[PDB]
Design an enzyme around this catalytic site. Structure first.
Site, mmCIF file in Angstrom:
data_model
loop_
_atom_site.group_PDB
_atom_site.id
_atom_site.type_symbol
_atom_site.label_atom_id
_atom_site.label_comp_id
_atom_site.label_asym_id
_atom_site.label_seq_id
_atom_site.Cartn_x
_atom_site.Cartn_y
_atom_site.Cartn_z
ATOM 1 N N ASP A 280 0.802 -1.151 -0.100
ATOM 2 C CA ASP A 280 -0.195 -0.203 -0.150
ATOM 3 C C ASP A 280 0.864 1.201 -0.070
ATOM 4 O O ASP A 280 1.367 1.646 1.189
ATOM 5 C CB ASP A 280 -1.014 -0.032 1.361
ATOM 6 C CG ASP A 280 -2.033 1.092 1.080
ATOM 7 O OD1 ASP A 280 -1.937 1.733 0.322
ATOM 8 O OD2 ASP A 280 -2.906 0.967 2.238
ATOM 9 N N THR A 281 0.891 1.797 -1.184
ATOM 10 C CA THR A 281 1.696 3.296 -1.361
ATOM 11 C C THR A 281 1.124 4.246 -0.643
ATOM 12 O O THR A 281 1.701 5.456 -0.335
ATOM 13 C CB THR A 281 1.877 3.521 -2.829
ATOM 14 O OG1 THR A 281 0.574 3.662 -3.389
ATOM 15 C CG2 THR A 281 2.652 2.349 -3.494
ATOM 16 N N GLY A 282 -0.262 4.092 -0.315
ATOM 17 C CA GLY A 282 -1.048 5.251 0.398
ATOM 18 C C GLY A 282 -0.934 5.184 1.990
ATOM 19 O O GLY A 282 -1.380 5.961 2.370
HETATM 20 C C1 LIG Z 1 -13.295 -6.096 5.096
HETATM 21 C C2 LIG Z 1 -13.089 -4.919 4.083
HETATM 22 O O1 LIG Z 1 -13.386 -3.671 4.987
HETATM 23 P P1 LIG Z 1 -13.649 -2.319 4.405
HETATM 24 O O2 LIG Z 1 -14.077 -2.438 3.034
HETATM 25 C C3 LIG Z 1 -12.025 -1.206 4.472
HETATM 26 O O3 LIG Z 1 -11.178 -2.228 3.701
HETATM 27 C C4 LIG Z 1 -10.301 -1.135 3.570
HETATM 28 C C5 LIG Z 1 -9.483 0.001 4.473
HETATM 29 C C6 LIG Z 1 -8.198 0.610 4.366
HETATM 30 C C7 LIG Z 1 -7.442 0.211 3.170
HETATM 31 C C8 LIG Z 1 -6.318 1.040 2.733
HETATM 32 C C9 LIG Z 1 -6.404 2.564 2.496
HETATM 33 N N1 LIG Z 1 -7.436 2.456 1.184
HETATM 34 C C10 LIG Z 1 -8.671 2.971 1.202
HETATM 35 O O4 LIG Z 1 -9.175 3.610 2.106
HETATM 36 O O5 LIG Z 1 -9.510 2.858 0.018
HETATM 37 C C11 LIG Z 1 -10.955 3.124 0.212
HETATM 38 C C12 LIG Z 1 -11.153 3.859 -1.218
HETATM 39 O O6 LIG Z 1 -11.130 2.510 -2.212
HETATM 40 C C13 LIG Z 1 -11.714 1.633 -1.307
HETATM 41 O O7 LIG Z 1 -10.891 0.266 -1.651
HETATM 42 C C14 LIG Z 1 -10.291 0.483 -0.373
HETATM 43 C C15 LIG Z 1 -11.155 1.007 0.549
HETATM 44 C C16 LIG Z 1 -11.817 1.997 0.042
HETATM 45 C C17 LIG Z 1 -5.268 3.263 1.675
HETATM 46 O O8 LIG Z 1 -4.666 2.569 1.124
HETATM 47 C C18 LIG Z 1 -4.368 3.679 3.136
HETATM 48 N N2 LIG Z 1 -5.112 4.531 4.075
HETATM 49 C C19 LIG Z 1 -4.560 5.881 3.970
HETATM 50 C C20 LIG Z 1 -5.214 6.800 2.779
HETATM 51 C C21 LIG Z 1 -6.688 6.820 2.874
HETATM 52 C C22 LIG Z 1 -4.588 8.324 2.961
HETATM 53 S S1 LIG Z 1 -5.552 3.969 5.465
HETATM 54 O O9 LIG Z 1 -6.145 2.565 5.436
HETATM 55 O O10 LIG Z 1 -6.788 5.003 6.326
HETATM 56 C C23 LIG Z 1 -4.128 4.144 6.496
HETATM 57 C C24 LIG Z 1 -4.040 5.071 7.536
HETATM 58 C C25 LIG Z 1 -2.849 5.307 8.409
HETATM 59 C C26 LIG Z 1 -1.615 4.407 8.320
HETATM 60 C C27 LIG Z 1 -0.372 4.605 9.333
HETATM 61 C C28 LIG Z 1 -0.869 5.001 10.398
HETATM 62 O O11 LIG Z 1 0.453 5.236 8.521
HETATM 63 C C29 LIG Z 1 -1.573 3.148 7.495
HETATM 64 C C30 LIG Z 1 -3.016 3.280 6.488
HETATM 65 C C31 LIG Z 1 -7.822 -0.901 1.996
HETATM 66 C C32 LIG Z 1 -9.296 -1.710 2.021
HETATM 67 O O12 LIG Z 1 -14.765 -1.466 5.112
HETATM 68 C C33 LIG Z 1 -14.503 -0.872 6.477
HETATM 69 C C34 LIG Z 1 -15.699 -0.101 6.860
#
Ligand SMILES: CCOP(=O)(COc1ccc(C[C@H](NC(=O)O[C@H]2CO[C@H]3OCC[C@H]32)[C@H](O)CN(CC(C)C)S(=O)(=O)c2ccc([C@H](C)O)cc2)cc1)OCC
EC number: 3.4.23.16
Lengths: 99, 99
Positions: B25-27
């Site tokens: 995860d690059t994000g």
């Molecule tokens: C069983 C499934 O549960 P679920 O569907 C959620 O699953 C997922 C939840 C999170 C992710 C990874 C997340 N991607 C998404 O948010 O993507 C959204 C949009 O596209 C959709 O696809 C995937 C979800 C939707 C980012 O890559 C990374 N983030 C930061 C970004 C937002 C700046 S972070 O995670 O917040 C985070 C914060 C702080 C740190 C440390 C501290 O640095 C590490 C990681 C992938 C799947 O429902 C739950 C209610």
């Protein structure tokens, strides 16, 4: 380009004719931008992130240019903490992970 | 290797003597993993993204193997809905974005 990951992979994008900064996010299935004004119709949707679900406006078939590469696809607009470019658009610009 | 982004970039990791599946995860600045009872001391932390914040435990200097590439750094453990390998570890395995 080849982008290392010692810093956040932030890039300039163009959407609705306006420039913004967004994060290349391989962990996002979808592209989610902070609340903004975009022309055309939209549909309500729910998307889940690390902390729960939020309500977003879904814009289909939206022109968006990412670091000089054009895409046309779905853009979600809502109370995200960060503009994230997700895989739906990263695939369009030919982005891969390599190590 | 080269990983396309048509599907989620899921890989097998080894941590705390266990095999798990996690997203490259690059994000994500840092690495967040599903609840697991790792040995040693830790510090509580709150991390936020789409939908709000969750409570996690911060473990330092944890060994992880990602596709046969060894790394060592901070791992956050808690009720995350997905396992994400963040930039703190992706840099150590030489991972880049390319388009
Ligand atoms: C069983 C499934 O549960 P679920 O569907 C959620 O699953 C997922 C939840 C999170 C992710 C990874 C997340 N991607 C998404 O948010 O993507 C959204 C949009 O596209 C959709 O696809 C995937 C979800 C939707 C980012 O890559 C990374 N983030 C930061 C970004 C937002 C700046 S972070 O995670 O917040 C985070 C914060 C702080 C740190 C440390 C501290 O640095 C590490 C990681 C992938 C799947 O429902 C739950 C209610």
């Amino acid at each position: 380009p080849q982008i290392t990951l010692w810093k956040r992979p932030l890039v300039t994008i163009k959407i609705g004719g306006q420039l913004k900064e967004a994060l290349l996010d391989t962990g996002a299935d979808d592209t989610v931008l902070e609340e903004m004004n975009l022309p055309g119709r939209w549909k309500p949707k729910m998307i889940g992130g690390i902390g729960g679900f939020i309500k977003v406006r879904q814009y289909d078939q939206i022109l968006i240019e990412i670091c000089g590469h054009k895409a046309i696809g779905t853009v979600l607009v809502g109370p995200t903490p960060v503009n994230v470019i997700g895989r739906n658009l990263l695939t369009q610009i030919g982005c891969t992970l390599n190590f």
